[PDB]
Amino acid sequence: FAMQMAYRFNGIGVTQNVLYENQKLIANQFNSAIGKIQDSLSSTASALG
Amino acid sequence: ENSVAYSNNSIAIPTNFTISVTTEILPVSMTKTSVDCTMYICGDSTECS
């Protein structure tokens, strides 16, 4: 999966070294962001408008 | 079913390819109908028209 995200970054002109030199941070950003999806959908139903 | 053989360190790279040719079909028009409303509804009667 880390080999894939380095390609996804390379596909937006962010060269691959920017991913691995930040990987655990990027994981925590993604994990935290996924966590906010639950809290948003749990706190309000009106998002499913 | 397919359990993909993932790991933290394994990649499958293709070594040969097929130039598949495939048909996509789309309609682009109906048939240009026109219905003469008075002749449909009242077919050749002045007493109707």
Q: Is A48 exposed, middle or buried (0-12, 13-18, 19+ CB in 10 A)?
A: exposed
Q: CA angle at residue A15 from A11 to A20, to 5 degrees? A: 110
Q: How far is CA A25 from CA A6, A19, A22, B4, in A?
A: 14, 9, 5, 27
Resolution of the model in angstroms = 3.6
Tokens of A9: 């970054």
